Design a protein around this ligand. Structure first.
Ligand SMILES: [Mg+2]
Ligand SMILES: [Mg+2]
Ligand SMILES: [Mg+2]
Ligand SMILES: [Mg+2]
Ligand SMILES: [Mg+2]
Lengths: 74, 99, 99, 29, 29, 13, 48, 49, 44, 134
RNA sequence: UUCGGGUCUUGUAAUUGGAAUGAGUACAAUGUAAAUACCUUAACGAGGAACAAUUGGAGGGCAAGUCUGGUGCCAGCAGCCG
């Protein structure tokens, strides 16, 4: 018998852009941002990852011959 | 709302049902018939009924009987009377197809 | 018993006409909105906003807003004082959106 | 014939619109 | 169209008007 | 490369 | 940026008529542009 | 092709201090004590107006 | 001389309404209803 | 000697000289005389009420053109007619003739934008969070 | 800036488990002049955990769609309208 207002009328959010869930909790958003940053840092430069685990199986990604990452004194 | 869809208006002191036609200006080049009202913006609507002075606001309702009230909002359309004329020249795109 | 308009003296040089709009007719809502100098908008505090309350406000806003006063009733049905205050706060702010 | 007339009508409408636009921009500044 | 129209004495005069010259007037009810 | 070039076209312009 | 999300809704492609299905896929403006440049490339290499 | 150097004229325009008295009265005398409260209170009043 | 342009418009309206009152106060009652009609507040 | 007194008992001459020279600043003069507001577009107000006179760009063909977003508004305070933006053509539908608008600082020569219409924010209406009361 | 270059557990628009808790509801008690609330606490209270975080800024892309100009297929404006 009674006609109650639905969700749209009560909150009156209107038209808003879609927003990803991470904004709801800043801590979670920064958590994902940081762990994403760590992955990129590996690409920029190598980063120590605990050292050797198991028998030495060689360099997985290959050795480059004519390439030097050496910072020379001028 | 849909074109040629009955809609009870409230103009001035008078309430009545008409068959409006929703149109667009098409970059101010013609009065082209639309099939439905825009989802979240205004559109030009032409309907037959008692004339009123411009700046006369009005509201629309599709259902007034309690038997069909349901639970949804019954206010359908809101707008402003913009002109009063004895003529209109709505046109529709009729595209011919060949092979 | 009250039926139809009732005119009563309210002051030395002021008079008021009370009119109980039929709650179940949307037509009666429309015409009252076009002549009502004041609206005593009745709201059930326990239940909250209802369609007829929200519908009428939209009619009033489009036909020329008259003075509106919200009246909250059935507040005694609340059993906790804390929940009563929260409901009053929520209702008031939502009412502050329309008015 | 209607091809000739329509070009004449369209030419008249385009010139009038541009003239109206020149007036509007002149007035605003 | 109004066939006829006439003015009548006020059936619910306000006190200021009355003394210059009952508080409720509900004929429908 | 194609996307990056179109972006620099905005930077240059 | 006063555009709504509805302002930027995607407009979907239509396809060939079922009756015309034997004639092949219904090309569009993007499809036409590929074959047009390739056609131009041949004649430029043909005219030289 | 000879261009002599400009003679920078002596100022005939009113000097800044003179400009204060170029009206019917002495502009320096009709001032306020708290120019800080002068600006703040007016700005509120203007929007209230 | 009114301070704001708004006051000027209100002054013009108020002056005009004031003029309307004087003519009607001059006017005879039976004539007045013939010209102005039944004013608001009349029980009719 | 730098052209100023330096004696240990020359305080008076320095003070009186400073007060006389302090009036040279335009900033000082405007602050004390209360004339810092003449240059303000609204004459000291942060906003400006007005009357919507005409929507000039309504006849434009190009949608969301710079012409389309302009409206001539008559400032109520002094009656001077001026021109203002609307945020977009979509909001232009809300604005109508003879309806109040609140203007704020922002095609050259146009220096104002509409922020409220009929006592309701345009952005509020544009987001469908409100209805314009008439 | 083209030329290209450097690096390695990365991605999923995929499924799935039982543990935790207060916003709120509320026996009671504490609190208070009497109350509300806080701190406590029986019993309820989580998977879209819809128990539905907001305010601004930057940039795309799409149509048998619309408008404007022209050394053809292009370009500009733009596109809630096919
Ligand atoms: Mg609490
Ligand atoms: Mg608020
Ligand atoms: Mg002081
Ligand atoms: Mg020396
Ligand atoms: Mg708690």
């Amino acid at each position: 018998g009674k006609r109650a207002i639905n969700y749209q009328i009560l909150k009156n959010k209107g038209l808003t852009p879609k927003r990803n869930k991470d904004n709801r909790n800043s801590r979670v958003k920064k958590r994902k941002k940081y762990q994403k940053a760590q992955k990129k840092l590996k690409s920029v430069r190598a980063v120590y990852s605990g050292g050797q685990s198991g028998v030495y199986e060689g360099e997985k990604t290959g050795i480059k011959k004519g390439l030097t990452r050496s910072v020379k004194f001028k | 709302l849909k074109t040629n869809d009955p809609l009870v208006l409230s103009l001035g002191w008078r309430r009545f049902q008409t068959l409006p036609i929703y149109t667009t200006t098409d970059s101010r080049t013609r009065t082209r018939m639309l099939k439905y009202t825009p989802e979240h913006t205004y559109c030009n609507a032409a309907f037959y009924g008692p004339l009123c002075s411009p700046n006369t606001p009005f509201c629309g309702v599709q259902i007034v009987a309690n038997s069909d009230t349901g639970n949804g909002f019954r206010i359908a359309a809101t707008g402003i009377v913009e002109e009063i004329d004895v003529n209109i020249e709505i046109v529709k795109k009729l595209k011919l197809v060949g092979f | 018993d009250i039926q139809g308009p009732i005119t009563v003296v309210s002051g030395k040089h002021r008079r008021l006409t009370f009119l109980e709009c039929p709650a179940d007719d949307l037509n009666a809502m429309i015409d009252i909105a076009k002549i009502a100098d004041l609206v005593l908008l009745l709201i059930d505090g326990n239940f909250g906003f209802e369609m007829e309350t929200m519908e009428f406000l939209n009619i009033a806003q489009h036909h020329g807003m008259p003075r509106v006063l919200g009246v909250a009733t059935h507040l005694d049905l609340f059993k906790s004082q804390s929940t009563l205050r929260a409901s009053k706060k929520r209702l008031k702010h939502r009412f502050w959106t329309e008015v | 014939f209607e091809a000739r007339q329509r070009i004449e009508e369209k030419n008249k409408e385009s010139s009038d619109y541009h003239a109206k636009m020149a007036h509007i921009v002149n007035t605003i500044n | 169209s109004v066939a006829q129209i006439e003015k009548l004495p006020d059936p619910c005069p306000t006190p200021f008007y009355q003394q210059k010259l009952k508080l409720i007037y509900a004929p429908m009810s | 490369r194609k996307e990056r070039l179109k972006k620099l076209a905005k930077m240059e312009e | 940026k006063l555009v709504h999300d509805v302002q930027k809704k995607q407009h979907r492609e239509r396809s060939q008529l079922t009756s015309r299905s034997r004639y092949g896929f219904l090309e569009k403006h993007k499809d036409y542009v590929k074959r047009a440049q390739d056609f131009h490339r041949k004649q430029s290499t043909l005219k030289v | 092709e000879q261009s002599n150097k400009q003679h920078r004229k002596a100022k005939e325009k009113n000097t800044a201090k003179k400009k204060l008295h170029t009206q019917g009265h002495n502009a320096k005398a009709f001032a306020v004590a708290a120019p800080g409260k002068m600006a703040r209170t007016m700005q509120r009043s203007s929007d209230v107006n | 001389e009114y301070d704001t342009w708004y006051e000027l418009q209100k002054a013009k309206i108020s002056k005009q309404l004031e003029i309307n009152n004087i003519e009607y106060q001059e006017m005879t009652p039976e004539q007045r209803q013939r010209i102005e009609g039944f004013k608001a507040g009349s029980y009719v | 000697g730098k052209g100023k007194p330096r004696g240990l008992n020359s305080a008076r001459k320095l003070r009186v000289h400073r007060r006389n020279n302090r009036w040279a600043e335009n900033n000082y003069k405007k602050r004390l005389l209360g004339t810092a507001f003449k240059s303000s577009p609204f004459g000291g107000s942060s906003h400006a009420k007005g009357i919507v006179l005409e929507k000039l760009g309504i006849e434009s063909k190009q949608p969301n053109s710079a012409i389309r977003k302009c409206v001539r508004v008559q400032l109520i305070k002094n009656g001077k007619k001026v021109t203002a933006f609307v945020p977009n053509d979509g909001c232009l539908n809300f604005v109508d003739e003879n309806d109040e608008v609140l203007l704020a600082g922002f095609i050259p020569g146009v220096r104002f934008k509409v922020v409220k219409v009929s006592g309701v924010s345009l952005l509020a209406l544009w987001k469908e969070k409100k209805e314009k009361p008439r």
